[PDB]
């Protein structure tokens, strides 16, 4: 693993300590603003479920994707920063995000 943001965060957040996860997205917004998405635009999830919601506005996100030569234990990621709408699946009470469906 290099020293770029993705390699470091994937490791510190216990995502690549025991394996190399292909892709992961990190959202750079306050926790409460992300939780607020669960009462925003209702949309169908990729699986057909209807408990997904899309944020009205774009949010700061970092996409982490394994490179072609990445192999455990030396996971390697390409870091891509962008501003896009997030789509999350919400459940429970309080109604909060439990899955990151996608980003637009």
């Amino acid at each position: 693993s290099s020293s770029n943001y993705c390699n470091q965060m994937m490791k510190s957040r216990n995502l690549t300590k025991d394996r190399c996860k292909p892709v992961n997205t990190f959202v750079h917004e306050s926790l409460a603003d992300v939780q607020a998405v669960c009462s925003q635009k209702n949309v169908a999830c990729k699986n057909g479920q209807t408990n997904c919601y899309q944020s009205y506005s774009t949010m700061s996100i970092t996409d982490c994707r394994e490179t072609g030569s990445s192999k455990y234990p030396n996971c390697a990621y390409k870091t891509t920063q962008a501003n896009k709408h997030i789509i999350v699946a919400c459940e429970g009470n309080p109604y909060v995000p439990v899955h990151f469906d996608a980003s637009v």
Binding site: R13, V27, L31, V98
Partner: peptide
């Protein structure tokens, strides 16, 4: 141990 909500935060949130 951790809930689905907690897992989401650990894996995706970086305030």
């Amino acid at each position: 141990k951790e809930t689905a909500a907690a897992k989401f935060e650990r894996q995706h949130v970086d305030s």
